[PDB]
Design a binder for this molecule. Sequence first.
Ligand SMILES: [Ca+2]
Ligand SMILES: [Zn+2]
Length: 182
Amino acid sequence: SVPAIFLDRDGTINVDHGYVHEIDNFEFIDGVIDAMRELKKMGFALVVVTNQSGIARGKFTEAQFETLTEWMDWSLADRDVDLDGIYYCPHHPQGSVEEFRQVCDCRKPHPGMLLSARDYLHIDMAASYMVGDKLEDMQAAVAANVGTKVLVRTGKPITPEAENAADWVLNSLADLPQAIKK
Ligand SMILES: [Ca+2]
Ligand SMILES: [Zn+2]
């Protein structure tokens, strides 16, 4: 079993402009790419787990999400960051788009995505981290029995509830490798 860093996307990896689905609006947060590269060096699997309800909302299609996700994957790989898994939930109970309109197991704070990754990559959850800027991230982690829950300040002005649920609060994903080294 391998330990992993589970990663929220908007507000953690890219700047959260809300319903981000275009390459020219995808902006990597400073230092996160180097941080992820170091996390790989330190022996962690990297797994993105991201809610994308904009799909259910009709803000953008699944096709558009794949295009952006593919681009993200290459950009990282080309910087010698090779993501071990990318999971997303396109659902929302009130989705305007029929295909995606539903309650589900995979929308954070449901731990579904993390459990799927766990089974797939044989991940050591207790030895793993979850990084995000929202409560739903911390709660998802709690349910999936992730060892360490890390909240970041690069997205949402953190709520006291999110803060409560978190084990650590870091300014950024960029700071995670040093925090773990220590
Ligand atoms: Ca987020
Ligand atoms: Zn879902």
